[PDB]
Every structure is written in C-alpha cells, then in structure tokens.
Amino acid sequence: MMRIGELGKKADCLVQTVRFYESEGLLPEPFRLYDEVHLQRLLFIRRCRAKDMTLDEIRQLLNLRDRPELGCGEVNALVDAHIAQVRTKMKELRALERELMDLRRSCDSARTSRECGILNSLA
Amino acid sequence: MMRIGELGKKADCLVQTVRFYESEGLLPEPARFRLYDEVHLQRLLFIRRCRAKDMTLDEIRQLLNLRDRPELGCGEVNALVDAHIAQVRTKMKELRALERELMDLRRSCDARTSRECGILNSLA
Ligand SMILES: [Pb+2]
Ligand SMILES: [Pb+2]
C-alpha cells in the first residue's frame, strides 16, 4: 500500500496529476491509500496520452478495459477515427505552410513598416 | 460613427468577439456611450486575416505594434512569419510520426472481446 506521493514517484508523475485524474473519474477508489491497481491504471493513462488521446477517449477505453466481456470493436473504431483526424490535420497544416510561405514572399529584407508587404497584404 | 453591434455586422463577427479583442488590448480606444469608426473596422479585418493564418493573440499584438509604428524597419515581421513556418514544419513531422504510431496500434487487433483486445493489451 502507498500514499499518493509514493504512487506518483512509481508512475513518474506529479501528485497534482494523480489528483487531476481522480477529479476526472479516471482512477478507481483508493487518509487515502493506493496499490498496484492504481499504478497500472496510471501507466495505462500515460501510454494513451502519449498517443494523443483525449480524456474522453481514455475514459471510454478504461470503461471497456474494466468490462472484459464486452466486444472490442469500438476500440478499433476509436483508433480509426483518431487516425482520420490526424490525416485531415496534416492536410490543413501543409496548406497553412504554403499560405505562410506566400505571405513571407510578399516582403524583402530592407523596408519600413509603412511599406511592409506582409502588413500591407493583411490590411 | 457606429455602435458595437453595427461594427460587428460590418466586420462579420460577434459583439462578444469584438469585446474579447478589446479586453486583450487589440483595439484602439473608441472614437467617442462608446462609438466606433472605420479605423476599428479595418483593425478587426486585420485581426481576422491574421487569425486565419494561425496567428496567436501574442503574434497579432506584435504585428499591430509594428503596424502602429510605420517609421520602423519591418525585419521583425519577416522573422515572426519565418518562426511560425518553422513551428508548423516541426508539428507536421510530429503528426506524421503520430499517424504511423496509431496505424501500428490499429494493426494489433483484427471479432474479439475486450479481454483479448490487442489494442487494450498493448496499452497495458
Ligand atoms: Pb479491438
Ligand atoms: Pb516586412
């Protein structure tokens, strides 16, 4: 059994982070003592957040993990939807890059603010 | 001269958005019971174009300060856009790596239960 400080140390995260996850309903119930189940939960959360998952996605995955008898098809759908999201964002960012490159080309090294091609194209 | 509602109509933005920009120091003082004029409209349009090019409120604040000083060199405007381009390029690299990571995750499950789920099991 561990206090929150020792749990945080073992999970390589701050006490305030553990308390954030508690306030968001991501940790099972536990002065308050914690054990191996809580540590493994924190590690699971950590790996999900490192794969860009939101708290809502993690809450859904945890609910499925807690119910081993349920079908896991929705897990595949969650990851597929995330992949689709990232692909759309990449397209948007490339278009933004090209837009900004065009903006940059509108001005040179030796001008005043009054003559600035960037400021003038934004006006 | 215009009230805020008319200014918002002309700039194609909400009154609350105008007030947000005011609270953030992005708009000059009202022309005159607050009244606005053409200068405020052109400012809102400038802000709109900047935000559509992914600029943050801090970058916009910087650009506005340089716009308000026409006698200065505009070299720092070029540097601001160059730094933004560099930022976007790094983000694109990170996102592509994330995409490839998520594709690998998805490949780990391929009519199973949660107990046997390859995705859930790889995250445990
Ligand atoms: Pb699955
Ligand atoms: Pb310039």
A109 residue type, one letter: S
Two tokens at B11?
Answer: 């700039």
**Nearest CB partner across the interface for B74, out of A83, A86, A107:** A107
Q: Which residues have beta carbons under 5 A from ligand 2 (an ion)?
A: A 107, 116, 118; B 74, 77-78
Spatial CB neighbours of A4, under 8 Å, sequence gap ≥ 6: A15, A18, A19, A32, A34
**Nearest CB partner across the interface for A72, out of B78, B120, B123:** B120
Q: Across the interface, do A75 and B123 touch by the CB < 8 Å criterion?
A: no
Two tokens at A89?
Answer: 């964002």
A108 residue type, one letter: D
* A&B contacts, CB < 8 Å: 138
**Nearest CB partner across the interface for B53, out of A40, A71, A100:** A100
With tokens 């999201």, the residue in question is A85
Spatial CB neighbours of A64, under 8 Å, sequence gap ≥ 6: A70, A72, A74, A75, B114, B117, B120
Rounded distance between C-alpha atoms, residue A113 and residue A109, angstroms: 12
Q: Are A65 and A44 in contact (CB under 8 A)?
A: yes
Q: Across the interface, do A68 and B109 touch by the CB < 8 Å criterion?
A: no
Rounded distance between C-alpha atoms, residue A13 and residue A15, angstroms: 7
Q: Across the interface, do A101 and B85 touch by the CB < 8 Å criterion?
A: yes
**What's the distance, CA B102 to chain centroid?**
27
Task: Pick the residue from chain A with its C-alpha nearest to B67.
Answer: A113
Contacts of A123 in chain B (CB under 8 A): 42, 45-46, 67
Two tokens at A23?
Answer: 């306030």
Sequence spans of domains, chain A: 1-123
Q: Compute φ and ψ for B6, nearest 5 degrees.
A: -70, -40
B73 residue type, one letter: G
Q: B74: CA distance to ligand 2 center in Å?
A: 4
**Nearest CB partner across the interface for B81, out of A47, A94, A118:** A118
Please spell the DSSP secondary structure of B52-121, one letter per residue: HTT--HHHHHHHHHHHT-TTSB-HHHHHHHHHHHHHHHHHHHHHHHHHHHHHHHHHT----BGGG-HHHH
Two tokens at B64?
Answer: 């506005």
A3 residue type, one letter: R
Closest CA relative to residue A74, chosen from A63, A90, A87, A85: A63
Task: Pick the residue from chain B with its C-alpha nearest to A46.
Answer: B123
Q: Compute φ and ψ for B73, nearest 5 degrees.
A: -60, 145
**What's the distance, CA B55 to chain centroid?**
4
Contacts of A52 in chain B (CB under 8 A): 98, 102
